[PDB]
């Protein structure tokens, strides 16, 4: 109707979520950040036709019975929706994610293309792509499996909850399951993986130590492996998955992960600087000879930021680096850019050195 008019309308001025809810205008999530989409708070009435108006008459009838729906609904050629009907304050309320089959470059990331192109040649190891909701993180996946599908011939099953972005048949297969729908879990969906001849295999994220030793050990056996990771860099996503473990493992997962570890890139989302909305932090790891000893050993394993500092050559960098990148090319403010930093301390530093 009108609701499919402001829908398309929401989707093009590129939200990622919708926010239909009782008192409140339509809010939309655009880069990050709800704003209202309107002026007029949706009354419980409104928000109910909304609702029947996305519904299937069977789904009208099954939503009498529950609580929460969660469903899928599409505008055909304008978008894919995830749709979360629940309940509130005796209104119902709804929220809608965009599925989108449009994958941004790798320049539009701000991810360094030499790097990401040399990751994806690999056909073995952990790729490990880090930082809390909201980093990009299934962002910079999209656009991984994406250079893959195009430029290989392979099998890619990711297992996903939920999925963020739908691939098509490229040069490679693109296999994907929906945690809740297609398979169980994370865990059921890379244990039976291992049987469906893959070549890539993306585990959404890793939640268990069963799940993370699943994904070393795929990583071991000579598969590509991507996953993620909810911690803020190198140092913090190395300990953090050792730490899955009880104590008296720990150096056979040190092992375990030096040898299979690829990269790791940490991320974060800043403000941009002009304020036309975000750009990326980022933070590379590259499983080098040298960086594996360091992993495989405990007492040589912070020598990981020396490591990252001077390994442009691969091309690593650590955060608090390319934030002064960032800075003195005017992409953030000195305030986000300190705010961010590993150590506000060493980033004056480092930065007065341009
Ligand atoms: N490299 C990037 N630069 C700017 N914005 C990005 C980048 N990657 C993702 N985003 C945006 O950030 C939002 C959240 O990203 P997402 O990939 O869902 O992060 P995560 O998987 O860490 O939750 C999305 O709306 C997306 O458009
Ligand atoms: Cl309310």
Same mark, same amino acid.
């Given at each position: 109707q009108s609701l499919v008019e402001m829908l398309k309308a929401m989707v093009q001025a590129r939200a990622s979520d919708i926010h239909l809810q009782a /008192?409140? !205008? !339509?809010t939309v999530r655009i880069d990050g950040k709800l704003r209202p989409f309107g002026n007029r708070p949706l009354t419980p009435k409104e928000v109910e036709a909304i609702a029947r108006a996305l519904l299937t008459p069977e789904q009208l009838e099954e939503l009498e019975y529950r609580k929460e729906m969660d469903f899928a609904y599409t505008i055909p050629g304008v978008a894919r929706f995830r749709c979360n009907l629940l309940r509130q304050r005796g209104s119902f309320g709804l929220v809608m994610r965009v599925v989108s089959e449009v994958i941004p470059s790798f320049e539009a990331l701000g991810l360094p293309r030499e790097v990401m192109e040399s990751l994806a040649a690999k056909e073995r190891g952990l790729i490990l792509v880090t930082g !809390? $909701? /909201? +980093?990009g993180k299934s962002t910079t996946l999209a656009a991984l499996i994406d250079h893959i599908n195009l430029h290989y011939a392979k099998n890619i099953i990711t297992i996903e909850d939920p999925i963020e972005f739908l691939h098509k048949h490229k040069k490679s297969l693109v296999v994907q399951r929906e945690v809740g729908? #297609? $398979? #169980? +879990?994370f865990y059921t969906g890379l244990k039976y993986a291992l049987r469906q001849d893959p070549d890539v295999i993306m585990v959404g994220?890793?939640?268990?130590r069963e799940t993370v030793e699943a994904a070393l050990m795929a990583a071991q056996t000579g598969h590509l492996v991507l996953s993620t990771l909810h911690t803020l860099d190198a140092w913090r996503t190395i300990n953090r998955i050792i730490d899955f473990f009880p104590l008296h493992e720990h150096r056979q997962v040190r092992v375990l992960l030096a040898e299979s570890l690829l990269g790791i890139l940490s991320q974060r989302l800043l403000p941009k600087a002009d304020g036309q909305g975000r750009v990326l932090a980022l933070e590379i790891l590259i499983a080098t000879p040298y960086v594996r000893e360091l992993l495989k050993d405990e007492e040589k394993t912070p020598q990981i930021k020396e490591a990252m500092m001077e390994g442009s050559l691969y091309g690593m960098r650590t955060f608090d680096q390319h934030l002064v990148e960032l800075y003195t090319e005017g992409l953030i403010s000195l305030e986000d850019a300190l705010s961010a930093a590993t150590s506000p301390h060493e980033f004056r530093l480092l930065l007065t050195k341009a």
């Open positions: /008192g409140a !205008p !339509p !809390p $909701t /909201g +980093s729908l #297609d $398979t #169980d +879990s994220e890793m939640r268990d």
